[PDB]
Scaffold this active site. Sequence first.
Site, PDB file in Angstrom:
ATOM      1  N   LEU A 104      17.364 -12.474  27.544  1.00 11.18           N
ATOM      2  CA  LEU A 104      16.242 -11.872  26.883  1.00 11.18           C
ATOM      3  C   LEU A 104      15.172 -11.541  27.887  1.00 11.18           C
ATOM      4  O   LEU A 104      14.330 -10.681  27.635  1.00 11.18           O
ATOM      5  CB  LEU A 104      15.696 -12.795  25.826  1.00 11.18           C
ATOM      6  CG  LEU A 104      16.754 -13.252  24.839  1.00 11.18           C
ATOM      7  CD1 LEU A 104      16.107 -14.033  23.733  1.00 11.18           C
ATOM      8  CD2 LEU A 104      17.463 -12.059  24.285  1.00 11.18           C
ATOM      9  N   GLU A 129       4.791 -18.631  22.123  1.00 11.87           N
ATOM     10  CA  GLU A 129       3.840 -17.535  22.205  1.00 11.87           C
ATOM     11  C   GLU A 129       4.624 -16.275  22.548  1.00 11.87           C
ATOM     12  O   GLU A 129       5.140 -16.135  23.664  1.00 11.87           O
ATOM     13  CB  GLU A 129       2.728 -17.836  23.224  1.00 11.87           C
ATOM     14  CG  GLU A 129       1.748 -18.968  22.772  1.00 11.87           C
ATOM     15  CD  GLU A 129       2.085 -20.357  23.357  1.00 11.87           C
ATOM     16  OE1 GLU A 129       2.234 -20.485  24.589  1.00 11.87           O
ATOM     17  OE2 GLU A 129       2.192 -21.339  22.594  1.00 11.87           O
TER      18      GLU A 129
END
Lengths: 159, 159, 161
Positions: A104, A129
């Site tokens: 990712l 976050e």
Amino acid sequence: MLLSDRDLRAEISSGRLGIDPFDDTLVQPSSIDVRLDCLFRVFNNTRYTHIDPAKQQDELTSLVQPVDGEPFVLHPGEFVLGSTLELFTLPDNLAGRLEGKSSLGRLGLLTHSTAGFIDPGFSGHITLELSNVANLPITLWPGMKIGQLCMLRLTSPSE
Amino acid sequence: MLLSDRDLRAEISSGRLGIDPFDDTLVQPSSIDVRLDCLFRVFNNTRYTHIDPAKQQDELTSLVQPVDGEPFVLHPGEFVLGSTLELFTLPDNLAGRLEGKSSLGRLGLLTHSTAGFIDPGFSGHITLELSNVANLPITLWPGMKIGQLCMLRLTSPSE
Amino acid sequence: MLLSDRDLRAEISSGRLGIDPFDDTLVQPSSIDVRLDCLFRVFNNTRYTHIDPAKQQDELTSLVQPVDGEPFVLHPGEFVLGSTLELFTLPDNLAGRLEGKSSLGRLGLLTHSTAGFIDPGFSGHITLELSNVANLPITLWPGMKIGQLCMLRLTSPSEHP
């Protein structure tokens, strides 16, 4: 000092490190994969001029959940708070660090800007976050592998 | 547990840690400096609406190389993939962490957003995730020092 | 290998780890909280086309200091350099890592993008790279808790500090 897969398994199988729900296929050479929960917080920036860390601002975010079968779409420049699916419980002599997944990472996905350090004695779902610094939207699927958690041994147990 | 220069030297001069090409002047107090390779991937966002981690998206990025002697210009808000010039070869008892250089840090350059954690057993050129959070473009010269790599000792060899 | 509160205390109370000024309530289970100093550098991007790492660029930044009692307001997309209020002195068997505070992390605050790794033998105020990835401005108060510093033990003392 970084715990190996064998040592992570030892800590888990002896109940000193809590991971619920636990999935052994997630354990990596020197870390464990974590997954994306389905509740998110977005910021309500039409009511506030600014964030003041010294104040409390209880309208600052709202809770959201994608409709079943839908993704959460994260656009470039948007900032949102999420959680690990798993519930973690650390003992007094281990600390945690989140790291991104190489997969990712190449896609422009940030998971812990901001704050990825977990104190010994911590218990809860780990706050994520989320950020996208690529130049397309990314579709996030609840349940997906989102990152990985490393355990660091302390020189001695915490007071 | 963080290897010192002395121990990095030991691991290298014994062949347990592969670094090619190696350059002794790059060794720091508790890390090793790495340099920028000359190939980059940029994202072709005019043909895709979005990134989907769950699919194979085949022409999302493209190979880009500047003219020998020309800088790769990286503007604020662009995301590009690069690599370390060096080829790395880790044994089964060490993991690596990329960290920024203080020098380039103060100039707004990010080199591993995203993903800077390298599994034990890894072998290859380390992928860099390049970003510019400053308010000016930054000129990148292939061959320049771009960051530094730390070695962490694992509690025991991995499976 | 990460120093615990009790080991951080032993290192400090024996002078091998310098922290000035030191405040014991800031010690955390496996790190110590750090505070925001009051000088900031901002970038003067109206005079240059670009940053070149291989050149020296002296008029590249400017000194901003908030009037007292007031905050330095950090807008999304701006990049600024700041500093830990504390002075740190590391011995040659320890390295440092900055990490964000959980509380400020959930507000979109970045404190060390860029560079958070402190070499053994380091001595000085620690540089902070400040960013706001939220979608509101954040008001920064000099003196506030801004992050935390972890100490890592080295496998053996360093040769070329």
